[PDB]
Design a protein around this nucleic acid. Structure first.
Length: 88
RNA sequence: GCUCAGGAAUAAGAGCUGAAUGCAUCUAAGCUCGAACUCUGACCUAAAAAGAGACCUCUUUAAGGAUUCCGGUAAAAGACC
């Protein structure tokens, strides 16, 4: 069917996300984390416990970038909520 | 007699994050390391840098500069002390 290039993230409770200027800011029980996710042709909005990210052209580069940004947002919220561990 | 580094950014290469391609992936964005190479740091030269410089002092019929005179740490002539 359709090649729509929109993605939702469904932010969970606790994280105070924002998209001031370009840097994407979050805060929660496990401290705060910051990141910058600016890229032409890829717009991001934060609203109602979810961040919507999409593009305009169906070129595969746009689709790859929208996937990458969605993954980064998920990992940021997940990290600020509880944290991440590595065992060696 | 003296004759070093340290740092920044990199090549081949090794990784992290990561989607197109639900997974996976060093790569497509992004990030971390990485050479006697490159840059910086030492060293020599450089207001005739035409955007032709900055600051201070002394004095504009003076400050000061040259020539003569006695010389050499300098010297082909000039210059320099």
């Amino acid at each position: 069917m359709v090649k729509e290039i929109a993605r939702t993230i469904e932010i969970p409770e606790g994280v105070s996300v924002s998209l001031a200027q370009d840097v994407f800011t979050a805060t929660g029980p496990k401290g705060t984390v910051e990141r910058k996710l600016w890229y032409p042709g890829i717009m991001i909005d934060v609203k109602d416990g979810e961040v919507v990210v999409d593009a305009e052209y169906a070129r595969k580069e746009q689709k790859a970038m929208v996937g990458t940004f969605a993954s980064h947002i998920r990992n940021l919220v997940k990290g600020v909520n509880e944290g991440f561990e590595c065992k060696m």
